Amino acid sequence: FKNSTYSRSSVDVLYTFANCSGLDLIFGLNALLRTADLQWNSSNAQLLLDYCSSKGYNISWELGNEPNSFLKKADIFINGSQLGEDFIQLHKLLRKSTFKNAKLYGPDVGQPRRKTAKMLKSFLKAGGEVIDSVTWHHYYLNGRTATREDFLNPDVLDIFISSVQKVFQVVESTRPGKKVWLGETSSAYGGGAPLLSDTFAAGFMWLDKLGLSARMGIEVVMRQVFFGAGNYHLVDENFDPLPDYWLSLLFKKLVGTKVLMASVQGSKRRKLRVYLHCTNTDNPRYKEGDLTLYAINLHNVTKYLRLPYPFSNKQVDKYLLRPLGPHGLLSKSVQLNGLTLKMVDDQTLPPLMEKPLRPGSSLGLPAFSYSFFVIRNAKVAACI
Amino acid sequence: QDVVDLDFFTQEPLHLVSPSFLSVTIDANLATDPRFLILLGSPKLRTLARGLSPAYLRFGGTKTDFLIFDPKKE
Ligand SMILES: *[C@@H]1O[C@H](CO[C@@H]2O[C@@H](C)[C@@H](O)[C@@H](O)[C@@H]2O)[C@@H](O)[C@H](O)[C@H]1NC(C)=O
Ligand SMILES: *[C@@H]1[C@H](O)[C@@H](O)[C@H](O[C@@H]2C[C@@H](O)[C@H](O)[C@@H](CO)O2)[C@@H](C(=O)O)[C@H]1O
Ligand SMILES: *[C@@H]1O[C@H](CO)[C@@H](O)[C@H](O)[C@H]1NC(C)=O
Ligand SMILES: *[C@@H]1O[C@H](CO)[C@@H](O)[C@H](O)[C@H]1NC(C)=O
Numbered sequence: 001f002k003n004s005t006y007s008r009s010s011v012d013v014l015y016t017f018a019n020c021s022g023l024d025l026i027f028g029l030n031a032l033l034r035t036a037d038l039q040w041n042s043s044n045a046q047l048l049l050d051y052c053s054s055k056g057y058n059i060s061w062e063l064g065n066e067p068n069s070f071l072k073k074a075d076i077f078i079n080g081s082q083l084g085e086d087f088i089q090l091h092k093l094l095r096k097s098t099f100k101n102a103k104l105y106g107p108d109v110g111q112p113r114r115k116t117a118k119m120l121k122s123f124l125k126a127g128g129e130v131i132d133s134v135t136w137h138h139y140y141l142n143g144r145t146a147t148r149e150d151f152l153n154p155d156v157l158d159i160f161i162s163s164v165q166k167v168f169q170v171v172e173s174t175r176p177g178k179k180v181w182l183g184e185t186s187s188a189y190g191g192g193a194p195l196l197s198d199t200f201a202a203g204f205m206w207l208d209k210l211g212l213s214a215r216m217g218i219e220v221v222m223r224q225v226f227f228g229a230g231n232y233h234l235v236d237e238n239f240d241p242l243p244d245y246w247l248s249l250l251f252k253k254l255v256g257t258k259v260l261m262a263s264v265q266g267s268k269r270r271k272l273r274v275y276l277h278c279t280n281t282d283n284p285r286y287k288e289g290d291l292t293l294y295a296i297n298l299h300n301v302t303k304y305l306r307l308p309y310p311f312s313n314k315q316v317d318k319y320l321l322r323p324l325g326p327h328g329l330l331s332k333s334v335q336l337n338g339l340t341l342k343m344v345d346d347q348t349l350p351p352l353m354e355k356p357l358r359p360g361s362s363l364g365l366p367a368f369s370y371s372f373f374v375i376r377n378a379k380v381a382a383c384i
Numbered sequence: 385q386d387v388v389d390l391d392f393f394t395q396e397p398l399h400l401v402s403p404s405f406l407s408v409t410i411d412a413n414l415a416t417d418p419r420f421l422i423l424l425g426s427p428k429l430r431t432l433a434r435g436l437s438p439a440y441l442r443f444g445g446t447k448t449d450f451l452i453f454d455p456k457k458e
């Protein structure tokens with residue numbers, strides 16, 4: 001890994017892309033700029049903070065990426081204590097800037113291996129007072145070795161639960177109640193699994209990760225990547241959306257901020273994975289008290305879900321995603337309720353069209369599929 | 385039997401996620417592409433980006449720790 005420079009121009013491209021897209025930019029600062037005695041050298045960050053101030057850019061900050069592997073990446077070891085002190089120094093710089101209330105997130109550690117958990121714990125002891133959220137990273141697989149079977153394996157999906165429990169064990173011991181974010185996450189590291197991370201088959205891991213993150217207390221999940229060289233991109237090299245972009249858009253239209261719980265009465269409780277939130281109230285079709293159920297079927301047959309009292313006879317809207325043939329789960333095209341999802345034109349997203357079910361029918365979920373179901377007139381007090 | 389009974393807990397919210405719960409990254413490496421300006425300037429890509437608003441966009445990656453700001457560069 002070689003040092004590279006970037007220009008005011010690059011900063012403007014990035015800020016403008018975020019600003020004109022309605023996204024909130026978080027900019028990671030270079031943590032490997034070190035003084036004689038291995039303190040963070042804040043002088044380059046200072047130049048960037050000055051420049052961003054002078055342009056009225058509203059930007060949030062991070063310092064370093066995966067500091068746990070600095071020794072491997074750059075033959076420099078920074079312990080969590082020191083990194084905490086480095087974050088304290090960035091916080092003082094932000095407080096003296098024109099955006100004195102700017103947010104600071106970190107430390108963007110990898111998933112909690114023994115040595116990473118130790119670094120995170122010492123970082124939160126030293127620097128935890130000045131971060132607005134704890135960021136950590138998660139991948140299920142190595143993109144080089146990942147198989148199609150891995151992407152469909154509930155034993156692979158389930159490992160994420162132990163990672164989340166281990167991060168919360170460190171946070172609750174050092175900074176109880178601090179918000180916990182996934183700062184970088186996807187199916188597979190090393191740029192994704194060729195012919196897998198860009199397909200319908202990637203959607204099992206992405207929708208399960210969202211479900212479990214919400215259920216377990218993770219407040220924000222940051223998908224590696226929106227756009228880029230890695231085939232875990234949501235949008236390909238031709239600016240065409242891949243199935244995970246359509247999955248992500250549908251999740252945003254349907255799923256609300258209030259997290260509830262669903263479970264399957266069977267003991268098996270594998271391969272059939274269920275999540276329940278309040279419906280997104282910004283959705284104009286739906287109303288206060290509506291529920292959004294989402295479900296993953298990793299069985300090789302259709303399953304039929306029955307809603308409990310008092311939701312059994314409610315009007316339900318189905319939003320079932322299935323691949324466009326002929327490449328099955330390895331397709332880069334998806335249908336919603338049997339309609340291919342495609343841009344109308346370069347400026348126009350299509351409508352995402354519900355399929356109303358007959359009231360009191362069981363919820364059909366084909367083999368190797370995922371679906372959202374909105375329960376209309378659910379009248380759930382907790383959602384109102 | 386392929387029929388499955390669901391149990392729902394609806395008493396109270398167990399958690400509150402950010403409205404930006406589903407956020408995205410751009411890898412820091414993408415700023416070393418000579419076409420950075422053309423790519424992020426794409427009207428088509430901005431339409432897709434707007435679709436995911438509200439969201440955080442994290443500009444970060446391995447390259448975060450190998451990028452130096454140079455105010456003289458053009
Ligand atoms: C399908 O998967 C089988 C194991 O899963 C179980 O059997 C199927 C038929 C479903 O009822 C599922 O709900 C069960 O958990 C395999 O043993 C079998 O070889 C696979 N393929 C078939 C039968 O088509
Ligand atoms: C998290 C890192 O922070 C990411 O930078 C990294 O991806 C980058 C960019 C990607 O295109 C490239 O294939 C990989 C590995 O060379 O580096 C993530 C990853 O996919 O490994 C992850 O480590
Ligand atoms: C990057 O820059 C710093 C100081 O500007 C220098 O000490 C370091 O050797 C450089 N890192 C690499 C990997 O070349
Ligand atoms: C930090 O880096 C700058 C320029 O790269 C250097 O000239 C300066 O002396 C360094 N500051 C400290 C305190 O080591």
Ligand SMILES: *[C@@H]1O[C@H](CO)[C@@H](O)[C@H](O)[C@H]1NC(C)=O
Binds near residue numbers: 024058059099101
């Ligand atoms: C910056 O952005 C967020 C909205 O995404 C907002 O909460 C905050 O008030 C803004 N800060 C300033 C000083 O404009």
Ligand SMILES: *[C@@H]1O[C@H](CO)[C@@H](O)[C@H](O)[C@H]1NC(C)=O
Binds near residue numbers: 038079081082
């Ligand atoms: C962490 O590193 C700093 C800076 O090199 C050092 O002075 C300190 O003693 C180390 N902390 C621990 C707990 O080893």
Ligand SMILES: [Cl-]
Binds near residue numbers: 079080081118122
């Ligand atoms: Cl450490």
Ligand SMILES: [Cl-]
Binds near residue numbers: 227228229230411
């Ligand atoms: Cl990239």
